[PDB]
Design an enzyme around this catalytic site. Structure first.
Site, PDB file in Angstrom:
ATOM      1  N   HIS A 137      71.020 -27.212 -11.257  1.00 15.17           N
ATOM      2  CA  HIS A 137      72.213 -27.994 -11.667  1.00 15.17           C
ATOM      3  C   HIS A 137      71.976 -28.716 -13.001  1.00 15.17           C
ATOM      4  O   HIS A 137      72.951 -29.229 -13.527  1.00 15.17           O
ATOM      5  CB  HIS A 137      72.745 -28.862 -10.542  1.00 15.17           C
TER       6      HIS A 137
ATOM      7  N   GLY B  89      68.557 -39.366 -11.883  1.00 17.06           N
ATOM      8  CA  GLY B  89      67.380 -38.999 -12.693  1.00 17.06           C
ATOM      9  C   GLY B  89      66.244 -38.479 -11.836  1.00 17.06           C
ATOM     10  O   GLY B  89      65.308 -37.940 -12.404  1.00 17.06           O
TER      11      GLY B  89
ATOM     12  N   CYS C 181      66.243 -36.098  -9.549  1.00 12.57           N
ATOM     13  CA  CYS C 181      66.282 -34.659  -9.212  1.00 12.57           C
ATOM     14  C   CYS C 181      65.075 -33.931  -9.790  1.00 12.57           C
ATOM     15  O   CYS C 181      64.619 -34.258 -10.894  1.00 12.57           O
ATOM     16  CB  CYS C 181      67.561 -34.009  -9.697  1.00 12.57           C
TER      17      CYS C 181
END
EC number: 3.4.19.12
Lengths: 301, 301
Positions: free
Chosen positions: B41, B143, B145
């Site tokens: 993503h 942040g 991820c």
């Protein structure tokens, strides 16, 4: 979102852990530059635990009596000296993985990460608070002595704790890295026991703010209290007094939530008087006091 | 003594964390040999969150669009490919700090360490269990991820989790390191929500054994139950069924304490029916289910 008891990343400390063996005693050491720090009780025998004279025991040692192992590499000890309840073993090799570091002594109510180690090998990392009675509720088996507690600020490791002993209630005691015990404990055989402990009020309020930031609001109310009336209730439930400095330190969390500190104090008073009536806060059915206001700000940003 | 939620030492994983930026999206990557793994993503824009076609978005990318930073050193991307919900960015440099590693997928009820990271920089380490509903109760801000979950066996890092998203209840979802989601979650904008969760019965029993090993005995009784009668009570309180395999796995803890598994089951039945009547177990007023039998054996030896 979410709020977890979170340790510092342990890599900078892992690179400092070594094994120190005297006779049949093995424990851990901390290798920084060309010095290995470890509990002086490594030089004790079973036959002198009552009143060991450590100055005499150390005088009878040679550098060659200390076996220091950094992974599968033996470090040659070239000097030994006592520093309060810690031994400083000078070695012929500077640790190439020495981080930027400080030796800091913490206050009761402060938190730190523990890297539990056995035979110079890290096994796990967890957070501890220094209790008001100067003990820590850790997880330590025989062999864990010399495991260290620390905080990390930017790139700098602030070492605050070295493990020495387990007290009869299953709580832990040790020293700062200058070898000075936290609390009224000695590295000799006595009936020594943890003194009475109290709850760290400012930390409980910090954790209530963490809960609000994370969407637990059920314990909030329209009431405020005075600091004096709050402290009357705190004293009754074996909570530490809350000072204006604590209120000031809670300022940012107060600003972020829009909940005044003395408003949150009215919530805590109600929780102490009534309990949670079967509800939970951040996955706990107890009021949690091992998170500092700093811990909450760091994690909830 | 003592029993703590304990993470693995994080150093081997710290050395693999990098920053990956596409346009205005920064998240973390895992750098192993000459590959950086990160959530696909990262290639999304605000203007295609509904039904992103990731195959189309990736076709429109160039290696130069991916900015990969390992500390203060930029890594040159020389290949990009999609692996389910993870991106594999081939880089021109093998990570010299690559540990021995495996990609393992865990089961619900298993635990692992999370190294929470921001901008490729580790911030903290904590334990999580994979819930029966395939979510984890973590601590993750925007942040985070690409932060990974792992276990360490001897020298080998078993990577089991990469962070992708927060669900509306504040719980977390992500993938294995092959990019396959845990549970019925997607990396696209939907009203997706955690399904109903249950308590991990075998873990609660493991933690009762931890409590006994650590000298909490108040919940013990002379009663035993059958596995069938136990499971009738478990079902009623939204506990998972206990299998003979669970009983077998609890064998060593049973042997060590001398408390038969179905005897400990009679204690759990009483705790579910009556509550703790104001007492605590290992510092908890709730029955804890995020320690596996292995976690208890590892820590309590």
């Amino acid at each position: 979102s979410g709020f977890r008891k979170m340790a510092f990343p342990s890599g900078k400390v892992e690179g400092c852990m070594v094994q120190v063996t005297c006779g049949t005693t093995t424990l851990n050491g901390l290798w920084l530059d060309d010095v290995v720090y470890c509990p002086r009780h490594v030089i004790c025998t079973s036959e002198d635990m009552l009143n060991p004279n450590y100055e005499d025991l150390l005088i009878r040692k040679s550098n060659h009596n200390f076996l220091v192992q950094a992974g599968n590499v033996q470090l040659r000890v070239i000097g030994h000296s006592m520093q309060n309840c810690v031994l400083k073993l000078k070695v012929d090799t500077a640790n190439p993985k020495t981080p930027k570091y400080k030796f800091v002594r913490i206050q009761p109510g402060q938190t730190f990460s523990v890297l539990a180690c056995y035979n110079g090998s890290p096994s796990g990392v967890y957070q501890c608070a220094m209790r008001p009675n100067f003990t820590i509720k850790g997880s330590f088996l025989n062999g864990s002595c010399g495991s260290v507690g620390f905080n990390i600020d930017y790139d700098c490791v602030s070492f605050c704790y070295m493990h020495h002993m387990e007290l009869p209630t299953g709580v832990h005691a040790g020293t700062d890295l200058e070898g000075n015990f936290y609390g009224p404990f000695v590295d000799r055989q006595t009936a020594q026991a943890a003194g009475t402990d109290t709850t760290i009020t400012v930390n409980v309020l910090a954790w209530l703010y963490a809960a609000v930031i994370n969407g637990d609001r059920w314990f909030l109310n329209r009431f405020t209290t005075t600091l004096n009336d709050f402290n009357l209730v705190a004293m009754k439930y074996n909570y530490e007094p809350l000072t204006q400095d604590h209120v000031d330190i809670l300022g940012p969390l107060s600003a972020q939530t829009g909940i005044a500190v003395l408003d949150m104090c009215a919530s805590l008073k109600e929780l102490l008087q009534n309990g949670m009536n079967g509800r939970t806060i951040l996955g706990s059915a107890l009021l949690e006091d091992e998170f500092t206001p700093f811990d909450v700000v760091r994690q909830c940003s």
